[PDB]
Structure 1
Amino acid sequence: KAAAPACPRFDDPVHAAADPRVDVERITPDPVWRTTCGTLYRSDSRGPAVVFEQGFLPKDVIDGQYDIESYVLVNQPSPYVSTTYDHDLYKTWHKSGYNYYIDAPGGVDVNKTIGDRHKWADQVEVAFPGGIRTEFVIGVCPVDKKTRTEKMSECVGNPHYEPWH
């Protein structure tokens, strides 16, 4: 094989945002940004026809919960779209229909920002302020709820995905 190259470093930490109205200075605590560029994942019940068209939009960039600890622990409407480093986290999700694959720069590394002591540290989450544009959504695999497995013959690539590294 070969050894992997480092990742491109973007100047804007929310370059990936689907809603650029997000206010980075409102993020608390001081965010530790993800600097790796491996695939990330999101369990979502929303279908690819919607996600491939819109990307992942956050619930409320205006008056949503900008405190990452509060958002992780109680999940009010927020400027964030959560993803995970863990390909298999979909297996822990009740009924969410799809495992989305994401290739996006940046995001707030939740455990590096609020520590790995908290209740949901096992989710190894990356929270995207402003969400995630469709160009950074690779594709999706539907999940068979009864076996908690991906239906790999039914995965779909996002025609809008734009490789960048």
Structure 2
Amino acid sequence: AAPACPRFDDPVHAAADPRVDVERITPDPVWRTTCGTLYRSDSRGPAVVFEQGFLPKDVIDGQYDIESYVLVAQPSPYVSTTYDHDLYKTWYKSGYNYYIDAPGGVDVNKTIGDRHKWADQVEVAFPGGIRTEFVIGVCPVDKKTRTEKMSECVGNPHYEPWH
């Protein structure tokens, strides 16, 4: 039987940009307390992501309201991930399925409900993004079949297991 997950005191321990202001998050965030693998579709290549982590577009002046950010894709302090390994299949054009093992994140559907138009994305929004140490690796995606090119997956040399 699997054990329970470590719980960090800092809700944005994972942040690649610690300037994120947690008190500006609206509505009141429901933080993810599980620690399973999460995923992110991204067209940016692993040489970049493994060096930088996932940095958010705008931690200072971006859109801190999660419902707004989910509905209308504005520069924000958040990096979006999903609980769903297979969500990459519904992404048009996104070259890679990144694998993430990071503490925390805001559980979108627990925070804004599961009846909004994108509830099927089962999103976890990371305020301040995600340091490279929490990015496990990546698999490229074959666009025409919407499948992972599993012999071309790559592990992140900077990944640091923590549980």
What do the CA deviations read for 1:109-142 (whole angstroms, capped 9, x no partner)? 0000000010000000000000000000000000
Q: Runs of 4 or more off by more than 2 Å in structure 1?
A: none
User: Residues of 2 paired with 1:124 and 1:100: CA distance?
Assistant: 16
Tell me by how many angstroms 1:56 deviates: 0.0
Tell me by how many angstroms 1:75 deviates: 1.0
What do the CA deviations read for 1:93-120 (whole angstroms, capped 9, x no partner)? 0010000000000000000000001000
Secondary structure in structure 2 of the residue aligned to 1:30: coil
Q: Which runs of 5+ in 2 are unaligned?
A: none
What do the CA deviations read for 1:57-113 (whole angstroms, capped 9, x no partner)? 000000000000000000100000000000000000001000000000000000000
Secondary structure in structure 2 of the residue aligned to 1:49: helix
User: Residues of 1 paired with 2:66 and 2:135: CA distance?
Assistant: 23
Structure-2-length-normalised TM-score: 1.00
User: Residues of 1 paired with 2:73 and 2:61: CA distance?
Assistant: 14
What do the CA deviations read for 1:27-83 (whole angstroms, capped 9, x no partner)? 000000000000000000000000000000000000000000000000100000000
Work out the number of aligned pairs and report it.
163
Secondary structure in structure 2 of the residue aligned to 1:127: strand
Secondary structure in structure 2 of the residue aligned to 1:139: strand
Matches for 1:1-165 after TM superposition, within 5 Å: 3-165=1-163
Structure-1-length-normalised TM-score: 0.99
User: Residues of 1 paired with 2:68 and 2:93: CA distance?
Assistant: 24
Q: CA RMSD in A?
A: 0.2
User: Residues of 2 paired with 1:112 and 1:147: CA distance?
Assistant: 32
Tell me by how many angstroms 1:4 deviates: 0.3
Tell me by how many angstroms 1:143 deviates: 0.0
